[model samples]
Target: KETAAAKFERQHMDSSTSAASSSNYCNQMMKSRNLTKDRCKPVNTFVHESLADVQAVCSQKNVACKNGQTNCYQSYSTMSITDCRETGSSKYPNCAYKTTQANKHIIVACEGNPYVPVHFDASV
Candidate 1:
């Protein structure tokens, strides 16, 4: 059931994929990850850092998630990341995305015994 953690990797971690700095980065990625099929995901992110580094965020400083959850941790160092967001004019099946790259401290929610990132909250 905690394959949710694995899915988190699928949806969020793109460690080996360098930020190609292309306009269509998110377009190809969202579709490749099967995130833009039945309906386009309105907002998603890809962290371009190693899984071990990202996982270590779970042991970082405790912070409040955007939804006010207390299980979130904010990374101590900034990391490379991209945010894929749908335009207002975007629709399902098409699943258009605007890609933005940045270096910022990551905030994520963690769960499970080993304590791994289960959700992304924000990048600040």
Candidate 2:
């Protein structure tokens, strides 16, 4: 089974890239990253920061999760991120996405012994 921390890394972490310059970034990434298997993910975020910095969010200020859970934390500083939102006409195997880059404090849910980020709740 994939651990929450591992899943977070797979789905959200992208330190190698700084920003999405082309409009097709999401279209290419969402598919290449295996996020378009069954259905296109409506919205997803890719953090352009080191894994350690992303994980450090667990030590930041606490916040309410989108689901109202108390396990969420918001980053202390704005981080480089690419927001991938599926277009209205997006369809499976041909998923289209709008990629927007932004600098924002990201909110994430943390868990486990080391208390690492598990879910990307949102960005503010």
Candidate 3:
């Protein structure tokens, strides 16, 4: 079974590249990374930073998650990230996305024994 921490890494962490020069980044990545299964994810953000840096967000300032969960935290420093938003014309199995890159303070929810990020709540 895939753990929450592992799933978070697969779905949101992308330390390999910070630049999203191509608009098709999300369209390709959303499918390649297995986020296209079942249905297209409406929105998601990929953090372009080391796992340790992302994990450290759990210790930053506390914030309420989008779901009203109190376990969320915000990053102290701006981090590189790529936002993926599904296009209106997107259809399942043919998911289309718009890619936008920016530097912002990320918000995430943390959990488990090791206390790592489990969900990317938002960016501010």
Candidate 4:
């Protein structure tokens, strides 16, 4: 139940970190990279659901979208995205593209039972 502008905002806005959270996936990713805990914080980003639309956006940004495929996403889980490279064998087999940061809130177009992105972690 999100407004269209909210959805549009989710699709276009790039957020910066202002606070911290324990379960922040961006933090975890930074930690994996040996980044300092307090320095690089996680930011949340919102995503749009349509893969074709995502591809369009990525295309505008010069990001790659393979074939007619981009990524499948869901909004009910942790802030992780499945790359086409890793999720190529999945049941859906759609690659989940992500923004630069995590904890980023997204609105997924759930019209076709495709992946709806819930959230993701963006890092410093």
Top model by lDDT, which number? 3
What is the Cα-based TM-score of model 3?
0.94
Candidate 1: where are CA atoms >4 Å away? none
Q: Mind giving the per-residue lDDT tens digits that candidate 2 earns over 1-124? A: 9887898898999898887778888888888788999988889999999999998999999999999899999999999999999988888778889999999999999999898998999999
lDDT of candidate 4 over 1-112, digit per residue (tens): 8754344344333233333333443333333433333343223333323444432322221211223223323233233231111122322222222223244322232222
TM-score of each: 0.94, 0.95, 0.94, 0.19
- Residue 57 miss distance in model 3 (angstroms): 0.7
lDDT tens string, model 3, 1-124?
9999999999998888866778899988898889999999999898899999999999999999988889999999999999999988998878899999999999999998889899888899
What local lDDT does model 4 show for residue 80?
A: 25
lDDT of 3 at 112: 84
CA lDDT of 94 in candidate 1? 70
Task: In angstroms, give how far residue 4 of model 3 lies from its true place.
Answer: 0.7
Rank the candidate models, highest TM-score first: 2, 3, 1, 4
Tell me which residue pairs clash in candidate 2: none
Which regions of candidate 4 are displaced past 4 Å? 17-124
Candidate 2, position 91, lDDT:
81
CA lDDT of 8 in candidate 2?
88
